[PDB]
């Protein structure tokens, strides 16, 4: 590290890259976030707009795991098949892939993107978006609610 640092660039130059007029002082604005509102307000406004004051209720003891949900969009569901499985379904319209999204850790199925139309697929999941259910039904697939 020490080979390449700023001291090696400035070593004989007296004011050290920190200004002959200025003369580098211990804490020339005071500590940390102190100048907010008071004299660094312009910095806070232009770079940190939401910062000051309160919003909303207090939950007091939230717990993350109650609301924990990983989501997946329908577009990427056929991608959860390996290559040979995807070829096999593409060939054969007699059978649908069943997809248990839980093994892949997902719990809500969302509606984004296109599908290769006229091919059934069974989606098993806890939760589905309104659009996702409609598109899965539209393409001839099935939605299965399961805990």
């Amino acid at each position: 590290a020490t080979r390449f640092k700023k001291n090696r660039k400035k070593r004989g130059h007296v004011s050290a890259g920190h200004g002959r007029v200025g003369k580098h002082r211990k804490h020339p604005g005071g500590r940390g976030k102190a100048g907010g509102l008071h004299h660094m307000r312009i910095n806070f406004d232009k770079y940190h707009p939401g910062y000051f004051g309160k919003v909303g209720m207090r939950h007091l003891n939230l717990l993350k795991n109650r609301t924990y949900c990983p989501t997946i969009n329908v577009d990427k569901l056929w991608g959860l098949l390996p290559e040979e499985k995807k070829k096999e379904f593409s060939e054969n319209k007699d059978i649908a892939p069943v997809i248990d999204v839980t093994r892949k850790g997902y719990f809500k199925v969302l509606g984004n993107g296109k599908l290769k139309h006229n091919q059934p697929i069974v989606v098993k999941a806890r939760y589905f978006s309104s659009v996702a259910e409609k598109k899965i039904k539209a393409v001839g697939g099935q939605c299965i609610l399961v805990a």
Binding site: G32, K33, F44, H48
Partner: protein, 53 residues
Amino acid sequence: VAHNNVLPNVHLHKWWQHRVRVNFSKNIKKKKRRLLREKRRKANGGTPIEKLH
């Protein structure tokens, strides 16, 4: 300038250098654990120290 972050999140003002501990014992502890487990495993007649949970 200083548009990288609103805050320092560092909070070391409760005299951190007094409180501090530096840790690099890892492998040596593992060897001690291995030695202890080897000694136990051997000592019990070779009879498994594992137990079904």
